């Protein structure tokens, strides 16, 4: 949805043409030559490209841009290591935090929530409801007892009888 | 007098905000489903559980 | 439609390679999309059915490129139960963490490395989907060349010998696995994870078949006769190779002993569980004892992984529902907590100092207090200190092994002691003392390392406080493999 | 007000808060706070002992399931005998 | 003893002699969170409490003993003691 | 909804059909779970007896304690494999 | 060299200097080392099985020989248990009978039924 | 299906054109018309193989 300027980028490339390699551009243990490099760091930081030009443009524009961002990234991080460069604060986003806090972490919390509420659906709750349903099947007179008497009447029926039908299944055994 | 001081620190650090917000949201959501279960007979998340029948 | 999605996606990939040199952003993006897809599959999963829910066939004759709606099926089947989906969830939340784990240390040829790591993760993802013996076996050894290339190009001084051992020992056990798979496919004329409990073989044909599968499992969950490639392939791997290996390959062979052996070798398995108990007690004790004299630091965590897999095997071979469940909890919790330990030794400790000998490291608390916090929390989480998931697995597997044979359960219960001796002997050396005169002070632990650590610690603590959260997948498969007549 | 619950929850507060907020609160605060909270805990348990001398009727609190496997259930259950 | 320390390093439990300037001010927040969490856990675990004795009637346990005798009559199950 | 699927055995069915085999499998499994919650019901009843009884729990629920310890070796998960691979009376 | 296992690993070393093993604790503390804690100079050759002679090794007592101390320890143990067992013969006996119980020794109270009275029974 | 067979065999043709470009130390899309040439050739091989399997199935069903 965003776009860029190409002769900004070619003027950028011939700006970087006369600059030193990044292995000595900061090894000088000042702003005669270290004030033009922090400009270049700040130009690395801002987004030249958007996504609509990525798809519909050809390839040597892309190669131009790729070595541009390679040399610019080099000038940013080597200046950050030796020394915008000359400031100290904490608001910063590294490259992975966009899709690990906003995609990985909510998907993992989603996984937690799906496991917690999927644990309602299990065989022990269903099996206690089925055993209750079976003793209410055989003895419906427990139906018209009041509510907390019903609990213990069910329990005494469970103690008084099998209510499985497991020997029903093993007919070839019997 | 007494103990020597060190510089001031804000209370609500970013990790305090993140961990407190996520766990309070999870407890609030659990209580919301226990609220919704009594009214409608089923959880709000099992609305979204659509597996095929066993047969 | 589905082809147009892919050649849109191939064009997506080509354009972002043309404009960005690296791949790692898209590999992270595809990994987290794969996460969301597997959790959407878990939402639509029916826990009330024992059968295999999301089935698909590849390379059928009527449709070689794509899905199959046919009267006749001779391709490769795929599909899941709860047992498969447990290890799929464990796999899919580890793949982005291993792509993230090497976000800055691989400098020279990065795109090859991240492609190899994501490819290994995808192969092991598809290992748990498979439904034939040949479909399991094809993906089961697709990992090996990628592991060979990964260990050989990237690593320490000795990455040639480690790459050779990871091809050699694995190939050598897995060829005998292929022998037994061929015998199964010529007797039954079907290889299938669906029908295969219905077929009954003769007792001495079963006892011939069972040997070749158990030899490969002895190589890959490394039991005592060959437990031996594992410290060298760990101690000399790169970081994501070590993490993927000890989090997923060992648990893959733990999955294979359930999926491949317990259904159609029941009458063989009962005859052989004393031999498995010999080998598993003997790989708990002797490996847990051989860790006490180790000069290197990643090798200690490799031998730790041996001892924990030896605990898990007498859980699966226990003929008990408790043992099967505890072996699954042990495999998942170990796959959480052990890659965090390999990150402690290989990421926070080898990126900073590039040596791995124990004698340089002393008194790490006074310059790195939260690394030391991590080291002691992970040490206790690895031991069998409860509310961790490791104790749930170790306790239920020791209980099942006590039911099946009480004397080998009695001598297997001392693994609680033996697992703590070497771990705390390492941990108090790393944390305690005056700071080392060899180590110059470096940075404390960074945001991405703390991120990986916090995820791998919360996911052990949730299983450790409540192991019921994944019973809904397993309550069928905990009853499925029991043979108590 | 729940006597069986405060005995559990107040030393957990007294532990978790000095770690998560030690740099933010400092030693002169956290000392008085940790001790203050354990003082309140032990006053509650003296009062509960005084009440159980009245009737020998103990209290337990129940929480969620640790594990439900076939013949074996474990729950987080807490009683003062 | 008040030896010098590096202020480079940040630990969550404080560092060496950690004493921030606004420890009163943060102490009011810690006070509020502690009393609110203790009060909230106190009221949340109220219905999960029960007494040990006096829960169920003795009618219940007499008839459960009777039904256990019923389940023991039908299986012909003999005592511990008679051999 | 509390749905109750039908009960199938391993013995009436042909094993060449898979519908019926899978249902007999799940039937035998769920019946073991019903058996299991019967055992758990008696355990909770017994600890209610012990807590209500105090000192005379030896004689109020001798029979509940004997019932729990008689049910325990026989009321657990046993597995469908052992009955479907082998036929007694053959 | 000095220990038997240090002698046992003698033929496996080649191109390795074969140090005399000396415990790092029994060194002088007052000689200044590069690390005062491990008591070690900076390039000093390490023995084979050096982690048995490190500072982080066992404490390695100085005052008794180990065979002497095993004799003294097993000495004190058999001293106590021998005096314990001979002192059971010189005991005096009781001044009361062990007390008895109503309802035929509370057998119905101790679980029990009439076939099971010897298993769950008291003195009566 | 016939269409999936054709598109997949054309993908095999695209793979062999890509790999032969990259052995030559060329870019990927060096000569973009060789992609359609190779895809049409390998898709024709897929057409042949599909028709032979079809005739084979018809011979197998004529033994009824
Ligand atoms: C209740 C329910 C809670 C559920 C879980 C909540 C987790 C919240 C996560 C979060 O906060 O987001 C951040 C998290 C990343 O952490 P991060 O903060 O960004 O760290 C990056 C920075 O470095 C961090 O910033 P930094 O640079 O400053 O780093 C310093 C580091 C410090 O350095 C360290 O050394 C850390 C030490 C290790 C800490 C990690 C262990 C944490 C232990 C938790 C405590 C346990 C105590 C024991 C229990 C006692 C209770 C009885 O900071 C920390 O990490 C500290 C962590 C602990 C802080 C806790 C503060 C909480 C305050 C809460 C106050 C409560 C107020 C309530 C008031 C109520 C009033 C009514 O991102 C995520 O979302 C992670 C995903 C969360 C889900 C995890 C996985 C869940 C699913 C698992 C899979 C299911 C099982 C497996 C199935 C397998 C297949 C079958
Ligand atoms: C067998 C051979 C089949 C090859 C299939 C390749 C499909 C790539 C499609 C994605 C894409 O569009 O990539 C285009 C990209 C362009 O080529 P490139 O070298 O980057 O051109 C630079 C020009 N200055 O080309 C590339 O990105 C290079 C792709 C090379 C693939 C090499 C794979 C090496 C082995 C990886 C692990 C094994 C994977 C298999 C196991 C899973
Ligand atoms: C939906 C989208 C899916 C797209 C998936 C594309 C996968 C392939 C992507 C890829 O391979 O790219 C990685 C790398 C790119 O290379 P490059 O373009 O040169 O990077 C430029 C850096 N500025 O590619 C390479 O560098 C590969 C270079 C060749 C590597 C040859 C040596 C490794 C060979 C290992 C092969 C093992 C095969 C084993 C056999 C079976 C195992 C399963
Ligand atoms: C390189 C080693 C060599 C090994 C060779 C062995 C074979 C390799 C083949 C490589 C690719 C395998 C993965 C193919 C994915 C196909 C996805 C799929 O089949 O989904 C369709 C399936 C049927 O869906 P249906 O309802 O019938 O309608 C179709 C329209 N969706 O839908 C379903 O029923 C649900 C199934 C969901 C699909 C989940 C698949 C999980 C894994 C996806 C990532 C795997 C990537 C593998 C790439 C590396 C290969 C090892
Ligand atoms: C059940 C799960 C319980 C998990 C609770 C997690 C709590 C994590 C919070 C602990 C963080 C405290 C910390 O950062 O200690 C750092 C400590 C340095 O101490 P410091 O006073 O800063 O001195 C600085 C220079 N030496 O560095 C050290 O000295 C190392 C000691 C750290 C103490 C950790 C306390 C929690 C241990 C819980 C073990 C859980 C096992 C599972
Ligand atoms: C290194 C050495 C090891 C490497 C081994 C790698 C293994 C790669 C195997 C490739 C597996 C291809 C399976 C594709 C499945 C895609 C799919 O399922 O749908 C897309 C289409 C079929 O449509 P579909 O809806 O499935 O039709 C049947 C409906 N019942 O099917 C398609 O059109 C997909 C066409 C894919 C063409 C790929 C050709 C190779 C390219 C490289
Ligand atoms: C009627 C039904 C049957 C129809 C079937 C008949 C098929 C006829 C053939 C159709 C031809 C359509 C051509 C579509 C494929 C085009 C491939 C292509 O051109 O990709 C080029 C791309 C790089 O493009 P480029 O911008 O030129 O980069 C280099 C610049 N230095 O490089 C790439 O993207 C690499 C692509 C290789 C991927 C190989 C494996 C995936 C297939
Ligand atoms: C000492 C170490 C404890 C650690 C505590 C850690 C926090 C957990 C607090 C839950 C207390 C609770 O919500 O419990 C209260 C509820 C209810 O209890 P109920 O009896 O089962 O249901 C009522 C039965 N009636 C009707 C017979 C009375 O619980 C639950 O069923 C919900 C289970 C959710 C557990 C999910 C844990 C996920 C990890 C969270 C931490 C990362």
PDB file of N, CA, C and O in Angstrom, chain E residues 19-64:
ATOM      1  N   UNK E  19      17.668   0.260  47.428  1.00  0.00           N
ATOM      2  CA  UNK E  19      16.814   1.111  48.251  1.00  0.00           C
ATOM      3  C   UNK E  19      16.411   2.308  47.411  1.00  0.00           C
ATOM      4  O   UNK E  19      17.086   3.344  47.427  1.00  0.00           O
ATOM      5  N   UNK E  20      15.348   2.183  46.618  1.00  0.00           N
ATOM      6  CA  UNK E  20      14.958   3.278  45.728  1.00  0.00           C
ATOM      7  C   UNK E  20      14.425   4.466  46.508  1.00  0.00           C
ATOM      8  O   UNK E  20      14.041   4.350  47.673  1.00  0.00           O
ATOM      9  N   UNK E  21      14.424   5.624  45.848  1.00  0.00           N
ATOM     10  CA  UNK E  21      14.047   6.861  46.520  1.00  0.00           C
ATOM     11  C   UNK E  21      12.559   6.900  46.834  1.00  0.00           C
ATOM     12  O   UNK E  21      12.153   7.387  47.896  1.00  0.00           O
ATOM     13  N   UNK E  22      11.733   6.391  45.930  1.00  0.00           N
ATOM     14  CA  UNK E  22      10.291   6.358  46.152  1.00  0.00           C
ATOM     15  C   UNK E  22       9.853   4.989  46.668  1.00  0.00           C
ATOM     16  O   UNK E  22       9.026   4.309  46.072  1.00  0.00           O
ATOM     17  N   UNK E  23      10.393   4.591  47.815  1.00  0.00           N
ATOM     18  CA  UNK E  23       9.995   3.308  48.374  1.00  0.00           C
ATOM     19  C   UNK E  23       8.747   3.413  49.228  1.00  0.00           C
ATOM     20  O   UNK E  23       8.022   2.421  49.359  1.00  0.00           O
ATOM     21  N   UNK E  24       8.482   4.591  49.802  1.00  0.00           N
ATOM     22  CA  UNK E  24       7.168   4.880  50.368  1.00  0.00           C
ATOM     23  C   UNK E  24       6.084   4.729  49.311  1.00  0.00           C
ATOM     24  O   UNK E  24       5.135   3.957  49.490  1.00  0.00           O
ATOM     25  N   UNK E  25       6.259   5.431  48.190  1.00  0.00           N
ATOM     26  CA  UNK E  25       5.261   5.536  47.133  1.00  0.00           C
ATOM     27  C   UNK E  25       4.953   4.181  46.517  1.00  0.00           C
ATOM     28  O   UNK E  25       3.784   3.823  46.341  1.00  0.00           O
ATOM     29  N   UNK E  26       5.991   3.402  46.206  1.00  0.00           N
ATOM     30  CA  UNK E  26       5.783   2.043  45.725  1.00  0.00           C
ATOM     31  C   UNK E  26       5.243   1.138  46.820  1.00  0.00           C
ATOM     32  O   UNK E  26       4.549   0.152  46.527  1.00  0.00           O
ATOM     33  N   UNK E  27       5.573   1.437  48.080  1.00  0.00           N
ATOM     34  CA  UNK E  27       5.071   0.636  49.176  1.00  0.00           C
ATOM     35  C   UNK E  27       3.571   0.719  49.332  1.00  0.00           C
ATOM     36  O   UNK E  27       2.933  -0.249  49.747  1.00  0.00           O
ATOM     37  N   UNK E  28       2.991   1.869  48.995  1.00  0.00           N
ATOM     38  CA  UNK E  28       1.532   1.993  48.994  1.00  0.00           C
ATOM     39  C   UNK E  28       0.882   1.105  47.928  1.00  0.00           C
ATOM     40  O   UNK E  28      -0.174   0.498  48.173  1.00  0.00           O
ATOM     41  N   UNK E  29       1.519   0.983  46.752  1.00  0.00           N
ATOM     42  CA  UNK E  29       1.028   0.071  45.717  1.00  0.00           C
ATOM     43  C   UNK E  29       1.131  -1.383  46.155  1.00  0.00           C
ATOM     44  O   UNK E  29       0.207  -2.175  45.925  1.00  0.00           O
ATOM     45  N   UNK E  30       2.266  -1.757  46.753  1.00  0.00           N
ATOM     46  CA  UNK E  30       2.446  -3.131  47.217  1.00  0.00           C
ATOM     47  C   UNK E  30       1.473  -3.470  48.340  1.00  0.00           C
ATOM     48  O   UNK E  30       0.945  -4.589  48.391  1.00  0.00           O
ATOM     49  N   UNK E  31       1.211  -2.499  49.224  1.00  0.00           N
ATOM     50  CA  UNK E  31       0.192  -2.624  50.258  1.00  0.00           C
ATOM     51  C   UNK E  31      -1.177  -2.905  49.660  1.00  0.00           C
ATOM     52  O   UNK E  31      -1.874  -3.832  50.100  1.00  0.00           O
ATOM     53  N   UNK E  32      -1.560  -2.120  48.644  1.00  0.00           N
ATOM     54  CA  UNK E  32      -2.869  -2.288  48.031  1.00  0.00           C
ATOM     55  C   UNK E  32      -3.028  -3.617  47.321  1.00  0.00           C
ATOM     56  O   UNK E  32      -4.048  -4.294  47.473  1.00  0.00           O
ATOM     57  N   UNK E  33      -2.005  -4.021  46.560  1.00  0.00           N
ATOM     58  CA  UNK E  33      -2.069  -5.284  45.826  1.00  0.00           C
ATOM     59  C   UNK E  33      -2.082  -6.469  46.785  1.00  0.00           C
ATOM     60  O   UNK E  33      -2.829  -7.433  46.579  1.00  0.00           O
ATOM     61  N   UNK E  34      -1.313  -6.391  47.878  1.00  0.00           N
ATOM     62  CA  UNK E  34      -1.265  -7.491  48.833  1.00  0.00           C
ATOM     63  C   UNK E  34      -2.587  -7.660  49.563  1.00  0.00           C
ATOM     64  O   UNK E  34      -3.093  -8.784  49.681  1.00  0.00           O
ATOM     65  N   UNK E  35      -3.178  -6.556  50.037  1.00  0.00           N
ATOM     66  CA  UNK E  35      -4.441  -6.692  50.756  1.00  0.00           C
ATOM     67  C   UNK E  35      -5.571  -7.061  49.795  1.00  0.00           C
ATOM     68  O   UNK E  35      -6.438  -7.866  50.141  1.00  0.00           O
ATOM     69  N   UNK E  36      -5.528  -6.572  48.548  1.00  0.00           N
ATOM     70  CA  UNK E  36      -6.569  -6.922  47.595  1.00  0.00           C
ATOM     71  C   UNK E  36      -6.504  -8.373  47.169  1.00  0.00           C
ATOM     72  O   UNK E  36      -7.533  -9.046  47.068  1.00  0.00           O
ATOM     73  N   UNK E  37      -5.291  -8.891  46.970  1.00  0.00           N
ATOM     74  CA  UNK E  37      -5.128 -10.291  46.610  1.00  0.00           C
ATOM     75  C   UNK E  37      -5.492 -11.209  47.769  1.00  0.00           C
ATOM     76  O   UNK E  37      -6.140 -12.239  47.559  1.00  0.00           O
ATOM     77  N   UNK E  38      -5.109 -10.841  48.997  1.00  0.00           N
ATOM     78  CA  UNK E  38      -5.451 -11.663  50.153  1.00  0.00           C
ATOM     79  C   UNK E  38      -6.957 -11.677  50.399  1.00  0.00           C
ATOM     80  O   UNK E  38      -7.539 -12.740  50.637  1.00  0.00           O
ATOM     81  N   UNK E  39      -7.607 -10.510  50.295  1.00  0.00           N
ATOM     82  CA  UNK E  39      -9.061 -10.416  50.430  1.00  0.00           C
ATOM     83  C   UNK E  39      -9.776 -11.206  49.343  1.00  0.00           C
ATOM     84  O   UNK E  39     -10.769 -11.896  49.611  1.00  0.00           O
ATOM     85  N   UNK E  40      -9.275 -11.134  48.112  1.00  0.00           N
ATOM     86  CA  UNK E  40      -9.968 -11.765  47.001  1.00  0.00           C
ATOM     87  C   UNK E  40      -9.820 -13.283  47.031  1.00  0.00           C
ATOM     88  O   UNK E  40     -10.792 -14.005  46.774  1.00  0.00           O
ATOM     89  N   UNK E  41      -8.620 -13.782  47.354  1.00  0.00           N
ATOM     90  CA  UNK E  41      -8.430 -15.220  47.546  1.00  0.00           C
ATOM     91  C   UNK E  41      -9.215 -15.699  48.762  1.00  0.00           C
ATOM     92  O   UNK E  41      -9.769 -16.809  48.752  1.00  0.00           O
ATOM     93  N   UNK E  42      -9.324 -14.852  49.794  1.00  0.00           N
ATOM     94  CA  UNK E  42     -10.099 -15.186  50.982  1.00  0.00           C
ATOM     95  C   UNK E  42     -11.570 -15.419  50.650  1.00  0.00           C
ATOM     96  O   UNK E  42     -12.150 -16.426  51.065  1.00  0.00           O
ATOM     97  N   UNK E  43     -12.185 -14.528  49.873  1.00  0.00           N
ATOM     98  CA  UNK E  43     -13.604 -14.730  49.570  1.00  0.00           C
ATOM     99  C   UNK E  43     -13.838 -15.733  48.444  1.00  0.00           C
ATOM    100  O   UNK E  43     -14.925 -16.314  48.368  1.00  0.00           O
ATOM    101  N   UNK E  44     -12.856 -15.946  47.565  1.00  0.00           N
ATOM    102  CA  UNK E  44     -13.068 -16.847  46.435  1.00  0.00           C
ATOM    103  C   UNK E  44     -13.086 -18.307  46.869  1.00  0.00           C
ATOM    104  O   UNK E  44     -13.791 -19.128  46.272  1.00  0.00           O
ATOM    105  N   UNK E  45     -12.318 -18.658  47.893  1.00  0.00           N
ATOM    106  CA  UNK E  45     -12.254 -20.032  48.360  1.00  0.00           C
ATOM    107  C   UNK E  45     -13.226 -20.316  49.493  1.00  0.00           C
ATOM    108  O   UNK E  45     -13.067 -21.329  50.178  1.00  0.00           O
ATOM    109  N   UNK E  46     -14.215 -19.441  49.711  1.00  0.00           N
ATOM    110  CA  UNK E  46     -15.190 -19.674  50.779  1.00  0.00           C
ATOM    111  C   UNK E  46     -16.090 -20.890  50.550  1.00  0.00           C
ATOM    112  O   UNK E  46     -16.191 -21.717  51.473  1.00  0.00           O
ATOM    113  N   UNK E  47     -16.772 -21.076  49.401  1.00  0.00           N
ATOM    114  CA  UNK E  47     -17.667 -22.243  49.299  1.00  0.00           C
ATOM    115  C   UNK E  47     -16.947 -23.561  49.128  1.00  0.00           C
ATOM    116  O   UNK E  47     -17.586 -24.616  49.224  1.00  0.00           O
ATOM    117  N   UNK E  48     -15.647 -23.538  48.878  1.00  0.00           N
ATOM    118  CA  UNK E  48     -14.858 -24.751  48.814  1.00  0.00           C
ATOM    119  C   UNK E  48     -14.436 -25.242  50.187  1.00  0.00           C
ATOM    120  O   UNK E  48     -13.780 -26.284  50.281  1.00  0.00           O
ATOM    121  N   UNK E  49     -14.809 -24.528  51.244  1.00  0.00           N
ATOM    122  CA  UNK E  49     -14.560 -24.967  52.603  1.00  0.00           C
ATOM    123  C   UNK E  49     -15.737 -25.753  53.152  1.00  0.00           C
ATOM    124  O   UNK E  49     -16.897 -25.419  52.904  1.00  0.00           O
ATOM    125  N   UNK E  50     -15.427 -26.795  53.912  1.00  0.00           N
ATOM    126  CA  UNK E  50     -16.437 -27.552  54.625  1.00  0.00           C
ATOM    127  C   UNK E  50     -15.828 -28.032  55.929  1.00  0.00           C
ATOM    128  O   UNK E  50     -14.611 -28.007  56.110  1.00  0.00           O
ATOM    129  N   UNK E  51     -16.685 -28.435  56.853  1.00  0.00           N
ATOM    130  CA  UNK E  51     -16.192 -29.018  58.087  1.00  0.00           C
ATOM    131  C   UNK E  51     -15.848 -30.489  57.878  1.00  0.00           C
ATOM    132  O   UNK E  51     -16.193 -31.098  56.865  1.00  0.00           O
ATOM    133  N   UNK E  52     -15.160 -31.066  58.853  1.00  0.00           N
ATOM    134  CA  UNK E  52     -14.782 -32.469  58.742  1.00  0.00           C
ATOM    135  C   UNK E  52     -15.916 -33.402  59.151  1.00  0.00           C
ATOM    136  O   UNK E  52     -16.204 -34.381  58.458  1.00  0.00           O
ATOM    137  N   UNK E  53     -16.569 -33.092  60.265  1.00  0.00           N
ATOM    138  CA  UNK E  53     -17.674 -33.823  60.876  1.00  0.00           C
ATOM    139  C   UNK E  53     -18.964 -33.029  60.686  1.00  0.00           C
ATOM    140  O   UNK E  53     -18.976 -31.800  60.754  1.00  0.00           O
ATOM    141  N   UNK E  54     -20.071 -33.744  60.503  1.00  0.00           N
ATOM    142  CA  UNK E  54     -21.376 -33.123  60.527  1.00  0.00           C
ATOM    143  C   UNK E  54     -21.893 -32.774  59.163  1.00  0.00           C
ATOM    144  O   UNK E  54     -22.915 -32.088  59.047  1.00  0.00           O
ATOM    145  N   UNK E  55     -21.203 -33.237  58.129  1.00  0.00           N
ATOM    146  CA  UNK E  55     -21.555 -32.992  56.745  1.00  0.00           C
ATOM    147  C   UNK E  55     -22.771 -33.829  56.391  1.00  0.00           C
ATOM    148  O   UNK E  55     -23.832 -33.287  56.066  1.00  0.00           O
ATOM    149  N   UNK E  56     -22.634 -35.152  56.463  1.00  0.00           N
ATOM    150  CA  UNK E  56     -23.703 -36.052  56.063  1.00  0.00           C
ATOM    151  C   UNK E  56     -24.375 -36.642  57.296  1.00  0.00           C
ATOM    152  O   UNK E  56     -23.768 -36.704  58.373  1.00  0.00           O
ATOM    153  N   UNK E  57     -25.643 -37.048  57.128  1.00  0.00           N
ATOM    154  CA  UNK E  57     -26.366 -37.701  58.209  1.00  0.00           C
ATOM    155  C   UNK E  57     -25.781 -39.062  58.528  1.00  0.00           C
ATOM    156  O   UNK E  57     -25.101 -39.680  57.706  1.00  0.00           O
ATOM    157  N   UNK E  58     -26.085 -39.545  59.735  1.00  0.00           N
ATOM    158  CA  UNK E  58     -25.711 -40.912  60.086  1.00  0.00           C
ATOM    159  C   UNK E  58     -26.651 -41.934  59.467  1.00  0.00           C
ATOM    160  O   UNK E  58     -26.315 -43.133  59.419  1.00  0.00           O
ATOM    161  N   UNK E  59     -27.834 -41.476  59.014  1.00  0.00           N
ATOM    162  CA  UNK E  59     -28.703 -42.318  58.203  1.00  0.00           C
ATOM    163  C   UNK E  59     -27.982 -42.780  56.956  1.00  0.00           C
ATOM    164  O   UNK E  59     -28.033 -43.970  56.601  1.00  0.00           O
ATOM    165  N   UNK E  60     -27.301 -41.836  56.294  1.00  0.00           N
ATOM    166  CA  UNK E  60     -26.518 -42.112  55.091  1.00  0.00           C
ATOM    167  C   UNK E  60     -25.508 -43.236  55.313  1.00  0.00           C
ATOM    168  O   UNK E  60     -25.487 -44.217  54.569  1.00  0.00           O
ATOM    169  N   UNK E  61     -24.710 -43.148  56.367  1.00  0.00           N
ATOM    170  CA  UNK E  61     -23.599 -44.085  56.512  1.00  0.00           C
ATOM    171  C   UNK E  61     -24.088 -45.434  57.029  1.00  0.00           C
ATOM    172  O   UNK E  61     -23.500 -46.484  56.718  1.00  0.00           O
ATOM    173  N   UNK E  62     -25.201 -45.435  57.787  1.00  0.00           N
ATOM    174  CA  UNK E  62     -25.836 -46.698  58.168  1.00  0.00           C
ATOM    175  C   UNK E  62     -26.379 -47.444  56.954  1.00  0.00           C
ATOM    176  O   UNK E  62     -26.162 -48.657  56.808  1.00  0.00           O
ATOM    177  N   UNK E  63     -27.061 -46.737  56.054  1.00  0.00           N
ATOM    178  CA  UNK E  63     -27.574 -47.424  54.878  1.00  0.00           C
ATOM    179  C   UNK E  63     -26.490 -47.720  53.844  1.00  0.00           C
ATOM    180  O   UNK E  63     -26.639 -48.671  53.073  1.00  0.00           O
ATOM    181  N   UNK E  64     -25.374 -46.983  53.849  1.00  0.00           N
ATOM    182  CA  UNK E  64     -24.260 -47.345  52.977  1.00  0.00           C
ATOM    183  C   UNK E  64     -23.547 -48.585  53.491  1.00  0.00           C
ATOM    184  O   UNK E  64     -23.096 -49.416  52.698  1.00  0.00           O
TER     185      UNK E  64
END
